[PDB]
Amino acid sequence: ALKLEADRLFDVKNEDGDVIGHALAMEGKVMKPLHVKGTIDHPVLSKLKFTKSSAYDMEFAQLPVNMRSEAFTYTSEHPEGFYNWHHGAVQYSGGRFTIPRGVGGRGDSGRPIMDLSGRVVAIVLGGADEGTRTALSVVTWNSKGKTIKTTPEGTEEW
């Protein structure tokens, strides 16, 4: 098994070039958390006209006809249990996505949480530590395509 995947996850860098977040190609668009102020490290994507959505901390542009194929697929059905992401396992219970304490931080905004069939279930924005875990502030869409944002008490944007 070789992890040969399309180009869908992109870095957003700050003025001196530090990775401060992530952008993703999904459902025909390139989206990135609005709070992440930097540039998408991509010669084509960085020149697109992005549309702001402050109510959801989202910013998006339309995928160039070509790249439209190189993208993730979303899914609004997330039964409780475990999910995957860059750092390992993400748990979903009580309507909340949690990871262990001390794992999330700067650079993790824009990162997707996915299921075993490789579909995106959510996009990470920040986290609020509660006891031995961290409750994630994520963006998700429902069955009727409505964007939804969940933000725990005391959430700190990553």
Curated annotation (Swiss-Prot):
Mutating D41 to H/Y: effect? No loss of autocatalytic cleavage by capsid protein. No infectious virus is produced
Tell me the superkingdom of the source.
Viruses
Q: Where is this region: Interaction with spike glycoprotein E2?
A: 51-56, 143-147
Region (Dimerization of the capsid protein), start-end ranges: 79-89, 115-119
Q: What is the effect of changing S109C?
A: 40% reduction in autocatalytic cleavage by capsid protein. No infectious virus is produced
Tell me which residues make up the Peptidase S3 domain: 8-158
State where the protein is found. Virion; Host cytoplasm; Host cell membrane; Host nucleus
Catalytic residues, per the record, are: H35, D57, S109
Q: Where is this motif: Nuclear export signal?
A: 40-50
What is the recorded phenotype of mutating H35R? Answer: No loss of autocatalytic cleavage by capsid protein. No infectious virus is produced
- Which residues make up the annotated site Involved in dimerization of the capsid protein? Y83, L116
Domain remark in the UniProt entry: The very N-terminus also plays a role in the particle assembly process. The N-terminus also contains a nuclear localization signal and a supra nuclear export signal (supraNES), which is an unusually strong NES that mediates host CRM1 binding in the absence of RanGTP and thus can bind CRM1, not only in the nucleus, but also in the cytoplasm. The C-terminus functions as a protease during translation to cleave itself from the translating structural polyprotein.
Functionally, this protein is described as follows: Forms an icosahedral capsid with a T=4 symmetry composed of 240 copies of the capsid protein surrounded by a lipid membrane through which penetrate 80 spikes composed of trimers of E1-E2 heterodimers. The capsid protein binds to the viral RNA genome at a site adjacent to a ribosome binding site for viral genome translation following genome release. Possesses a protease activity that results in its autocatalytic cleavage from the nascent structural protein.
Q: How does it assemble?
A: Homomultimer. Interacts with host karyopherin KPNA4; this interaction allows the nuclear import of the viral capsid protein. Interacts with spike glycoprotein E2. Interacts with host IRAK1; the interaction leads to inhibition of IRAK1-dependent signaling.
Protein name per Swiss-Prot or TrEMBL: Capsid protein
Full-protein interval shown: 107 to 264 of 1245
